Amino acid sequence: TTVGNSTIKVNDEVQVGSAFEAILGIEGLNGDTEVYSAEYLFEYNAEAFILNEITSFNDSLFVKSKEVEPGKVRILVASLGNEIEKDSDLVKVNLTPKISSELEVLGLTTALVGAGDGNTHDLELSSKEVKINEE
C-alpha cells in the first residue's frame, strides 16, 4: 500500500510560447514516516511541451533529473539534512507549450519516498490536466 500522496499543482490554462511551472510535492504523509528523499517519474506529452528546467522548490533539497525517454523524466529529490515536511512542495518543473490543445495531462506515474527506516515506500500517484491556448 502507500504512506502518503504525491501532489502536482499547475494552472488549468497554459499558452503556446509562455513558460509555466508544474509544482511537485507530497501531502498527508503518515505521522511516523520520516522522509529524507522522494522520486517521481514525471510524464508529459513531448509533442506539446518543451522541458525547460527542473529545480528544487527550495534550497534545503537538491534535485537530479533525466529525461529517460521523450516525455518521461526521472526526478530524484533528496534532503540536504533535515527531515522533509509532510505537506511540502519539492520540485518546480518549468515547461513551455508549443502546440495548442484542449487537454493535456501532466502525470506522476511513479512517486516514492525514502524514509528513516532505510526503506523506500509508495505514495499515491497523481496527475493534472491543462488546456493549452493559442499564442
Q: Resolution (in Å) of the shown entry? A: 1.7
Q: Which residues contact 14 (CB under 8 A, 6 or more apart)?
A: 20, 95, 97, 130, 131, 132, 133
CATH, residue 67: 2.60.40.680
Which residue range is the domain that position 32 belongs to?
1-135
Q: What total number of domains does the chain contain?
A: 1
Nearest to 107 by CA among 83, 76, 77, 72: 72
Q: For the residues of the chain, what is the DSSP string, one character each?
A: --SSEEEEE--SEEETT--EEEEEEEES--TT--EEEEEEEEE--TTTEEEEEEEESSTTEEEEEEEEETTEEEEEEEESSSPBPTT-EEEEEEEEE-S-EEEEEEEEEEEEEEETTS-EEE-B-EEEEEEEE--
Apex CA 43: angle with CA 86 and CA 8, to 5°? 30
